[PDB]
Amino acid sequence: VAGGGVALIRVASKLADLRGQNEDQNVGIKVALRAMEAPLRQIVLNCGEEPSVVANTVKGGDGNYGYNAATEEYGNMIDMGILDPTKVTRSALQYAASVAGLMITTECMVTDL
Amino acid sequence: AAKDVKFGNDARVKMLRGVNVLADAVKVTLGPKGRNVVLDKSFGAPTITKDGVSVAREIELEDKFENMGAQMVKEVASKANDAAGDGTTTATVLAQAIITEGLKAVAAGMNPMDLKRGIDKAVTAAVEELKALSVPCSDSKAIAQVGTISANSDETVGKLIAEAMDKVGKEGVITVEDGTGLQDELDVVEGMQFDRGYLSPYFINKPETGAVELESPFILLADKKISNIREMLPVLEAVAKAGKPLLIIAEDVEGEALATLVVNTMRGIVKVAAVKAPGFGDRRKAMLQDIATLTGGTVISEEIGMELEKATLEDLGQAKRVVINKDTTTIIDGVGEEAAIQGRVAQIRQQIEEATSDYDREKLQERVAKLAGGVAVIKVGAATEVEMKEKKARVEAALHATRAAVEEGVVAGGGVALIRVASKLADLRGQNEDQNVGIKVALRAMEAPLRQIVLNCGEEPSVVANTVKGGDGNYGYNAATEEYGNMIDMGILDPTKVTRSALQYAASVAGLMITTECMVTDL
Amino acid sequence: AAKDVKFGNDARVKMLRGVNVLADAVKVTLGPKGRNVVLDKSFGAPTITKDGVSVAREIELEDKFENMGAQMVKEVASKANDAAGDGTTTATVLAQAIITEGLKAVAAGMNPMDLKRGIDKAVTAAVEELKALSVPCSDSKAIAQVGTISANSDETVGKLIAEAMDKVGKEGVITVEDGTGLQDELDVVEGMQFDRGYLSPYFINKPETGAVELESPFILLADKKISNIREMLPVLEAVAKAGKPLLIIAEDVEGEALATLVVNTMRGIVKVAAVKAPGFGDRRKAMLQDIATLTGGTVISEEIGMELEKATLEDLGQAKRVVINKDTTTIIDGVGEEAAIQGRVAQIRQQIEEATSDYDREKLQERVAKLAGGVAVIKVGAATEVEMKEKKARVEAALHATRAAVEEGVVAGGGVALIRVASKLADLRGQNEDQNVGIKVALRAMEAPLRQIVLNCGEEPSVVANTVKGGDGNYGYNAATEEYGNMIDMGILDPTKVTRSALQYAASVAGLMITTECMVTDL
């Protein structure tokens, strides 16, 4: 899939109408879709560029349109050879959501004095 | 003590800390969504305010060095408000910005003198750019538009200003007074104004604005230098008997016995203010005459053998009111003799006709302009004393904003003009790389005001700044409505003079501070 | 200075702590089952009280920041009592509630400005709701019912109020004095009242109520601004010779020499009080005339060449008694000339007939109303001096409660009206989510008073509140009898004006405090 974090951004945009059983579930859905932009934003931030501007521009186009952080030029991620195995992207997302889900609910904590 | 002395980076971190406290306290009030600041008072309940100038006035730090940093920025930034009637908080925000990044570069090993040359260059060009971006404000339509904008969109205040300015000239002297009822009043009166402020700041009267008002004062004109009270006591006694305040216009009042007593002693018994006579040399004498005839009083000159010891009340002139400030004295209603005043104006008018040089003619007509010009008095009327007092404040504010506007124009407000001119100067360079980072330091600092304003809005300042910069002309962000658009059309603007003064003064201290290697203070 | 400066959440926790001390101390006294509070006195034995206003007056904290928080809420909440004659403790309880939850949201990252907008909206709608829930109190039957209710169900007090109001109008000036025996007395007397309080709080006389009473004082009318004692000494001497106190009604008294001596010096030698002349502009002069004729004295105007230096006793007016407070002066029995007073009233009556505008007519008749209106004096009689003094207090209280009632109606007391209007506003929303939590913050805060009241009853506040909210109309909980029912029928009500003022002022400080980013105080 397109690298540079664009695959997850395209996926997130396709899920804009996804809803759950209640408002709290809807917030959870939004939390996840928002986190899906984080990878592209951090890549840009590490470049010394502005995350929101680049994110906004990538979301503006579609398909394999993305930001090439090496050359700091927009273009077709596939044509520029910036690809990620679908397997690593999928795994990164599932393990992140898995541990995040666990953490979320902590009623009480117990530890050694 | 014995002193404590600091050098280089040590003195650097100290000043930066003192500046950050001052700037951080003051800048919270910036913008339409500015936050409040609570200033404790021993006098009673704390004061909740959004007036950045009031906050700054209260800032004093414990550490002697840090306090020096804060007092430096406070002194220069205050000059902006004095000059353009506004600009102090923006000056502080900019100063903090230039100083923060300047010192970082200095600490990175860059040459302080170069960095300052760069900062200075960027400011020179930027001021040129602001001048270009400015929109003139001359016609009465414009004058009124600016006036109402300043009076929070009050069509009546704009009208008042425009009317007063039309009836007395755009550069004429206009005062604002309490109304006698519901209707506003405007009347040109026999008066004058000269660039001479109070000799002692301790002369400040009820007007919290840093001025002094004197109702029906006795004007004392003496071209002598009064250093001792002895030869003036008789006059003071007579004035005291009249219960009326006194205005002393002398060559100069020395703080030996006169200014000493006049201040330290007259803290309630009498109301006495002192100012220097206008001009110097022979002109000083001539002008005093103009003032004398205008107020109907006579000047005491040792040349003629005049003795202040014998100065009776009839020698003293009088005016309905007199307002003195940091660097100006305005005689609002001289009790002079109409014909006498007209006689002098004519006498000087003749002198101008028989002048033998440009310099003579110029100064001669500047004098007739003062006498023959008069003062336009605005009387703010309203339905209730509260409304009247509130509107009056608005008129005073709008009047200053407008005068500044007629002088140098108007520019996109909301911190947009500064971020605009900065986006243009992206290719500016200097004699060398240090000078270059100096230039960049200033340019980035020019974005501080808008970013602060957007910060108080709970919005992302780097996003709005990025957007405003990408635009062109007077296109900016309206923090009031929180929408982008044409700042001028949206009626969001500042007199080009305040934005200019703010930037220049801010760069001034920032430069001095960046090129300071040693600080000395008591232990 | 050297100052101590705090920003954001640091200043937040500080103010919250100062507010919690003040509110928790004062709120223990809330409701029929309110607890006592012991206030130490160096003067002797401690005072045991349930008067929340007295407790608040004693609250000062050691920490400069926390004390700022407490003094802020105290200042605003006190305005409620001043405005509606009650509401201070409720104002404090509400303020604490809004501030507590508001700051939590702020600390949670919500936008302070939005939160305040939300709070402000809920209060606007809520006040509308209270206005709707209100029951008018105009007919003498109603006036008496409210009066007795306020006088702890004393039919006689209600009668007195209703009688006085009927004999002088519902918005007429009514005073309460000691009786001459067993029977109550009521007599309208030549008098007047204007909205002008004492210039210096240090003028407070024996009346612990924060007022000043002057028996047979000499009224001094001068439209000049008296800043120095010099030109007034002769008068003061003459007044002193008379042994009678003095009331100075001038344009304004400046704290240079006059107000300085009048207070700092006259701490026992004489009884002098000073207040500003009513109105401004030309009206200020006219009104002074009314007061002059009313008291039989003459006004000293520089315009006419009047000199205070020559102001003899015959120029001074006189009245049987004068009562001045924070923002009002009441001339109880002017020694004026009946015919003269009638002459003026007629003269002004004529002016009204020949008025050329609504504004002129309005103000003109406001003046005749004052002169032709008079003062209704209630003389509280009883069997014993103790009873007389106790009943008198009740009459004074009931009088204020009733006046507030005629002005804006009455609503379910016991903290039920606020919890009522709140239950209605459950669907209210704003421009955004922050604004929404702002709205919720206010609505939840509206339950604080009732919950406190029920807390002091040893009952479960969340159960009672839940029940009262589930009901409708004036259905609530009677904490006296500890049973539910119709508050109005149970005679448990508050003037809609106090509930309104309490909520508005409470939301005012809560808003300011929630949008405060920096606090400055001396180290």
DSSP C328-352: -EEE--B---HHHHHHHHHHHHHHH
Phi-psi region at C97: left, alpha or beta (left = phi > 0; alpha = psi -120 to 50)? alpha
How crowded is residue C506: how many other Cβ atoms within 10 Å of its Cβ? 31
Exposed / middle / buried, residue B108 (Cβ in 10 Å: 0-12, 13-18, 19+): exposed
For residue C252, the 8-state DSSP code is: E
Question: Which residues are CB-neighbours of B465 under 8 A, at least 6 positions away?
Answer: B419, B447, B450, B451, B454
Note whether B87 and B503 are within 8 A (CB): no
Note whether B186 and B160 are within 8 A (CB): yes
3-class SS of residue B47? strand
Interface contacts (B, C; CB < 8 Å): 107
Instruction: Pick the closest to residue C418 from C484, C346, C502 (CA basis).
Output: C502
Q: Could you tell me the two tokens for C480?
A: 């006296």
CB-CB: which of C2, C434, C519 is closest to B61?
A: C2
Exposed / middle / buried, residue A103 (Cβ in 10 Å: 0-12, 13-18, 19+): exposed
Distance CA B106, CA C193 (A): 69
**Scanning every residue of chain A, which has its alpha carbon at the shortest distance from the alpha carbon of B470?**
A53
Exposed / middle / buried, residue B505 (Cβ in 10 Å: 0-12, 13-18, 19+): buried
Please report, for residues B53, B212, B421, the alpha-carbon distance to residue B201 in angstroms, rounded to integers and kept in the order given: 18, 10, 38
Radius of gyration of chain A (CA): 16
The method recorded for this entry reads cryo-EM
Question: Which residues are CB-neighbours of B23 under 8 A, at least 6 positions away?
Answer: B73, B92, B93, B95, B96
Phi-psi region at B482: left, alpha or beta (left = phi > 0; alpha = psi -120 to 50)? left
DSSP chain A: -BTTTHHHHHHHHHTTT---SSHHHHHHHHHHHHHTTHHHHHHHHHHTS-HHHHHHHHHHS-TTEEEETTTTEEEETTTTT-B--HHHHHHHHHHHHHHHHHHH--S------
Note whether C116 and C438 are within 8 A (CB): yes
Q: How close B461 gets to chain A, by Cα (Å)?
A: 12
State the number of CA atoms in the 13 A half-sphere of C208 facing the CB: 4
State the number of CA atoms in the 13 A half-sphere of C421 facing the CB: 28
3-class SS of residue B485? strand
Question: Which residues are CB-neighbours of B358 under 8 A, at least 6 positions away?
Answer: none
Question: Which residues are CB-neighbours of B468 under 8 A, at least 6 positions away?
Answer: B416, B419, B420, B450, B475, B476, B477, B484
Task: Select the residue from C308, C520, C522 to test the B interface by mutation, using most B Cβ atoms within 10 A.
Answer: C520
Using a CB-CB cut-off of 8 Å, the residues of chain A touching B466 are 50, 52-53
Using a CB-CB cut-off of 8 Å, the residues of chain C touching B62 are 2-3, 523
How crowded is residue B202: how many other Cβ atoms within 10 Å of its Cβ? 12
* Distance, CA of C223 to chain centre: 28
For residue B146, the 8-state DSSP code is: H
Using a CB-CB cut-off of 8 Å, the residues of chain C touching B270 are 228
**Scanning every residue of chain B, which has its alpha carbon at the shortest distance from the alpha carbon of A55?**
B463
Strands C516-522 and C3-7: antiparallel
Q: Could you tell me the two tokens for C448?
A: 């604080």
The identity of residue B443, as a single letter, is L
Distance CA B41, CA B212 (A): 24
Question: Which residues are CB-neighbours of C387 under 8 A, at least 6 positions away?
Answer: none
Widest Cα–Cα separation across chain B: 74
Instruction: Pick the closest to residue B168 from B439, B380, B377, B386 (CA basis).
Output: B377
How crowded is residue B302: how many other Cβ atoms within 10 Å of its Cβ? 12
**Scanning every residue of chain C, which has its alpha carbon at the shortest distance from the alpha carbon of B45?**
C71
Distance CA B467, CA B447 (A): 12
Question: Which residues of C carry a binding-site annotation for ATP?
Answer: 29-32, 50, 86-90, 414, 478-480, 494
Instruction: Calculate ∠ Cα C162-C164-C167, nearest 5°.
Output: 105
Using a CB-CB cut-off of 8 Å, the residues of chain B touching C113 are 33, 35, 456-458
Q: How close B462 gets to chain A, by Cα (Å)?
A: 8
How crowded is residue C257: how many other Cβ atoms within 10 Å of its Cβ? 18
Distance CA C502, CA C508 (A): 10
Distance CA C427, CA C46 (A): 49
Note whether B106 and B115 are within 8 A (CB): yes
* Distance, CA of B361 to chain centre: 30
Note whether B449 and B52 are within 8 A (CB): no
Question: Which residues of B carry a binding-site annotation?
Answer: 29-32, 50, 86-90, 414, 478-480, 494
CB contact under 8 A, A53 and B463: yes
Distance CA C237, CA C257 (A): 16
Distance CA B300, CA B302 (A): 7
For residue C198, the 8-state DSSP code is: B
Exposed / middle / buried, residue C188 (Cβ in 10 Å: 0-12, 13-18, 19+): middle
Distance CA B67, CA B248 (A): 36
Using a CB-CB cut-off of 8 Å, the residues of chain B touching A50 are 462-463, 466
Distance CA C42, CA C213 (A): 27
How much of chain C is helix, strand and coil, in % rounded to 5? 55, 20, 30
Note whether C451 and C135 are within 8 A (CB): no
Distance CA C366, CA C278 (A): 12
Distance CA C263, CA C283 (A): 29
3-class SS of residue B21? helix
The identity of residue A108, as a single letter, is C
Distance CA A18, CA A15 (A): 5
**Under an 8 Å CB criterion, which residues of A touch B?**
50, 52-53
CB contact under 8 A, C74 and B45: yes
Distance CA B222, CA B317 (A): 12
For residue C135, the 8-state DSSP code is: B
β strands within B139-279, DSSP E: 173-178, 185-189, 192-194, 212-215, 218-226, 246-253, 272-276
Place of tokens 């010394």: A48
β strands within B10-98, DSSP E: 36-39, 47-49
CB-CB: which of C2, C11, C112 is closest to B60?
A: C2
Q: Provide the resolution (angstroms).
A: 8.5
How crowded is residue A46: how many other Cβ atoms within 10 Å of its Cβ? 10
Distance CA C69, CA C348 (A): 50
For residue C315, the 8-state DSSP code is: G
State the number of CA atoms in the 13 A half-sphere of C150 facing the CB: 31
3-class SS of residue B281? helix
Distance CA B416, CA B449 (A): 8
Question: Which residues are CB-neighbours of B67 under 8 A, at least 6 positions away?
Answer: B18, B60, B61, C2
Using a CB-CB cut-off of 8 Å, the residues of chain B touching C64 are 40
Distance CA C54, CA A52 (A): 56
Q: Which residues pair with B453 in a beta bridge?
A: none
* Distance, CA of B82 to chain centre: 2
CB contact under 8 A, A50 and B460: no
Note whether B375 and B334 are within 8 A (CB): no
Distance CA B363, CA C375 (A): 67
* Distance, CA of B150 to chain centre: 17
Using a CB-CB cut-off of 8 Å, the residues of chain A touching B463 are 50, 52-53
CB-CB: which of C7, C257, C279 is closest to B269?
A: C257
Q: Is A97 annotated as a binding residue?
A: no
Q: Which residues pair with B521 in a beta bridge?
A: B4
3-class SS of residue C160? helix
The residue count of chain C comes to: 523
Instruction: Pick the closest to residue B421 from B137, B136, B122 (CA basis).
Output: B122
Question: Which residues are CB-neighbours of C215 under 8 A, at least 6 positions away?
Answer: C245, C320, C321
Distance CA C511, CA C499 (A): 18
